[PDB]
C-alpha cells in the first residue's frame, strides 16, 4: 500500500499546498512574518511532494529504479531538504509566536527564509554527493543506493545522528521552551483577568444590593481577587512600583469600602465601591486591556493553525526520528527486524503530514 | 524589646463586667490594630473584637457582638476590653495580637506579636 | 463568614520526620493564610506570614505552600521542639480572621 498511499499524498498535497501557496500570497497576502514562514512552509512542501511520485513509481515496482542517477540524487536531497526546512520554519514560527505574545521585522524575515532554504541545501549536500544508481548483482534491479567510502566511514552515523538531533532535539527543545513561556505568559494574563472579572461581578452585585450582609460578602469576594490580582504581575522599577501600587490603592479602597459597610451605612459602602470603579481606570485599565490582548492571540486563528502543525509534525516524525535511532544503534554495533520491518512505514508516515498540512487551514481557517 | 503585656484577668462572678487591659512596648498603638484573640480551655483560638486606634473602626466577634466595648488610649499606648454580662463561654484565655496596616509587609504578617494572654473565668 | 478547615487533628511523628498539615478555607482567601505554634501554657507564636513566607527569627525547616485553598505547612527536621499545636489563620481582612481547629505535633511510639 505504499506505494498507492504516495500516490494518495500527491493528489491531496499537490491541490492542498498549491491553494494553500496562493492564499497566503493574495487573499491574505504577506502582511505579517508568520505569513512568509507559512508560506516558506507550504513551499517547501510542494517541492518534497515534487519529488514524490518518483518514489512512489519506485516503490510501485518492487524497488527497483527505471530513472537516472541524477532523479535519485534529487530525490534522496529533497527528502532530507524537507525534513530540515520544515524543522527550522516550524522552529521559526515558533519563536515569532513567542515574541509576538510575550514581547508585542519582514526583510529580516526575508533573510531568515533564504538562511533556512541555504542551510537545508547543506544539510542535504551528503545525499546529494554520494546517492547513486547500483546495479543489483547480476540481475536488472537498480536502486538509489548510498555509497559511502573507507574515507567517508561511518557517514550514515553521521547523518542518522544529525536527523535525530539537529533536525528533532534541537528544534523540539526550542518549540517546547517557545510554547511553555507562551502558556506561562497566558496564566499570568488568565490570572489577572479571572480576578478582575470576579472582582467586577463583585462590584456589580454591590451596586444591586439591599442589606450590609450582601454588600459584605461582595467586598470579601472583591478584596480577595484584588489580593490574587496583585499577586498575578504581567510577564516583564516602573512597573512594579506602578502595577502593585495601583492594586495597593484599590485594595485599600475595598477596606475603607468594608469599613463603611460593617458599621451598616450600605450607601456609603455603595459609594466607596463607586470610587473603586473609578480608581481601575487610572492604575488596572492598562494592564488589564495588555491582559486581554495577550488572550485575544489564542483565538487567533493563525496561532492555532501554527500549533496544530507544530504538533502533527513533531508527531508523525517520532516514528521515523526513534527507528532512525534505533538503526544508528544497530550500526554502531549498540545493539532488529522489527527496525527495518516498519523501516518504510516511518518513512511513509513521516512525510504524510504534507499531505494534509493544508487541511489545518481548511479546519482552522 | 517590643511586647504586650495583659493585666485585669482574674476571677470574677457571672453577669458582671471586667476591663481587660493590653499595654504595649517598643511601638506606636497608632501604627497597628490590636486584636482580642479568645481561647477557651482545652480548644482552639477564636478572634474575639479589634481596634485600628488610627482610624476608631472596631469589630466584633457575632458571639460577643453587642456585649462588649473595645476601646483604646494613644498616649499610653494601650488597649481595654470592656465585657458586660459575662456568660459561661466567655472563661478563657485572652489575648493581645498587634496586627499591622494596608499597605506593605506590616499587613501580611498577621498577629507578629502576641500578648501574654489572661485568664478569666466565671 | 470563611471557614477554615485543618485535616489532621491528631499528628504523631518521631524526631528528624516530615510531617505535613493541610488547612482549607471555605473560599478563596488570596495568600492570606498565616500559620502560628502554640506550646501548651503559651501565646501563639508566627510562623508563615504570607501563605508561603517564613516569618524571620523562627527556624528555616518550616516551610508553606499555597495550591488554590489548600494551604500546607511542611516540617522536614523534626526536631524536639516542635511538638507543639500548629494553627492556620485567614486574615483576609480585620474583621474576618478565623484560625483553624488545630493541629498538636506528638511523640510517635
Known amino acids: 500500500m505504499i506505494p498507492t498511499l504516495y500516490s494518495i499524498i500527491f493528489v491531496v498535497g499537490i491541490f492542498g499546498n498549491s491553494l494553500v501557496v496562493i492564499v497566503i500570497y493574495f487573499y491574505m497576502k504577506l502582511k505579517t512574518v508568520a505569513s512568509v514562514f507559512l508560506l516558506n512552509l507550504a513551499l517547501a512542501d510542494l517541492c518534497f511532494l515534487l519529488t514524490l511520485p518518483l518514489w512512489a513509481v519506485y516503490t510501485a515496482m518492487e524497488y527497483r529504479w527505471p530513472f537516472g542517477n541524477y532523479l535519485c540524487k534529487i530525490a534522496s536531497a529533497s527528502v532530507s531538504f524537507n525534513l530540515y526546512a520544515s524543522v527550522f520554519l516550524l522552529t521559526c514560527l515558533s519563536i515569532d509566536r513567542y515574541l509576538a505574545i510575550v514581547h508585542p521585522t519582514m526583510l529580516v524575515a526575508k533573510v531568515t527564509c533564504i538562511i533556512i532554504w541555504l542551510l537545508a541545501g547543506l544539510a542535504s549536500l551528503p545525499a546529494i554527493i554520494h546517492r547513486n544508481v547500483f546495479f543489483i548483482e547480476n540481475t536488472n534491479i537498480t536502486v538509489c543506493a548510498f555509497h559511502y567510502e573507507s574515507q567517508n566511514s561511518t557517514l550514515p552515523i553521521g547523518l542518522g545522528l544529525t536527523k535525530n538531533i539537529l533536525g528533532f532535539l534541537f528544534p523540539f527543545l526550542i518549540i517546547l521552551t517557545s510554547y511553555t513561556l507562551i502558556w506561562k505568559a497566558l496564566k499570568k494574563a488568565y490570572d489577572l483577568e479571572d480576578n478582575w472579572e470576579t472582582l467586577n461581578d463583585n462590584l456589580k452585585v454591590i451596586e444591586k444590593a439591599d442589606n450590609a450582609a450582601q454588600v459584605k460578602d461582595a467586598l470579601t469576594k472583591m478584596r480577595a481577587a484584588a489580593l490574587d490580582a496583585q499577586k498575578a504581575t504581567p510577564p516583564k522599577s516602573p512597573e512594579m512600583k506602578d502595577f502593585r501600587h495601583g492594586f495597593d490603592i484599590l485594595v485599600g479602597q475595598i477596606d475603607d469600602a468594608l469599613k463603611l459597610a460593617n458599621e451598616g451605612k450600605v450607601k456609603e459602602a455603595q459609594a466607596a465601591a463607586e470610587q473603586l470603579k473609578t480608581t481601575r481606570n487610572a492604575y488596572i485599565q492598562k494592564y488589564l486591556e495588555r491582559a486581554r490582548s495577550t488572550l485575544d492571540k489564542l483565538n487567533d486563528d493563525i496561532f492555532k493553525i501554527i500549533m496544530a502543525i507544530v504538533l502533527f509534525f513533531f508527531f508523525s516524525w517520532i516514528p521515523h526520528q526513534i527507528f532512525t535511532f534505533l538503526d544508528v544503534l544497530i550500526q554502531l554495533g549498540i545493539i532488529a527486524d522489527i527496525v527495518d520491518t516498519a523501516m518504510p512505514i516511518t518513512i511513509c508516515i513521516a512525510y504524510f503530514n504534507n499531505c494534509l498540512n493544508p487541511l489545518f487551514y481548511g479546519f482552522l481557517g | 524589646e517590643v511586647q504586650l503585656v495583659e493585666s485585669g484577668g482574674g476571677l470574677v462572678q457571672p453577669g458582671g463586667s471586667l476591663r481587660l487591659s493590653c499595654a504595649a512596648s517598643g511601638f506606636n498603638v497608632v501604627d497597628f490594630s490590636l486584636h482580642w484573640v479568645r481561647q477557651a480551655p482545652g480548644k482552639g483560638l477564636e478572634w474575639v473584637a479589634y481596634?485600628?486606634?488610627?482610624?476608631?473602626?472596631?469589630s466584633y466577634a457575632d458571639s460577643v457582638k453587642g456585649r462588649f466595648t473595645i476601646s483604646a488610649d494613644t498616649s499610653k499606648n494601650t488597649a481595654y476590653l470592656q465585657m458586660n454580662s459575662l456568660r459561661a463561654e466567655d472563661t478563657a484565655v485572652y489575648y493581645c495580637?498587634?496586627?499591622?496596616?494596608?499597605?506593605?509587609?506590616?499587613?501580611?504578617?498577621?498577629?507578629?506579636?502576641w500578648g501574654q494572654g489572661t485568664l478569666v473565668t466565671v | 463568614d470563611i471557614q477554615m478547615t485543618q485535616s489532621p487533628s491528631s499528628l504523631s511523628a518521631s524526631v528528624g520526620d516530615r510531617v505535613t498539615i493541610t488547612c482549607r478555607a471555605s473560599?478563596?482567601?488570596?495568600?492570606?493564610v498565616a500559620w502560628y505554634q502554640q506550646k501548651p501554657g503559651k501565646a501563639p507564636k508566627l510562623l508563615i506570614y504570607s501563605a508561603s513566607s517564613l516569618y524571620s527569627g523562627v527556624p528555616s525547616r518550616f516551610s508553606g505552600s499555597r495550591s488554590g485553598t489548600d494551604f500546607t505547612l511542611t516540617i522536614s527536621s523534626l526536631q524536639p521542639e516542635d511538638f507543639a499545636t500548629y494553627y492556620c489563620q485567614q486574615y483576609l481582612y480585620y474583621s474576618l480572621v478565623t484560625f483553624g481547629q488545630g493541629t498538636k505535633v506528638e511523640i510517635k511510639r
Open positions: 481596634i485600628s486606634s488610627s482610624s476608631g473602626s472596631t
Open positions: 473560599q478563596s482567601v488570596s495568600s492570606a
Open positions: 495580637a498587634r496586627w499591622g496596616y494596608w499597605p506593605g509587609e506590616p499587613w501580611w504578617k498577621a498577629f507578629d506579636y
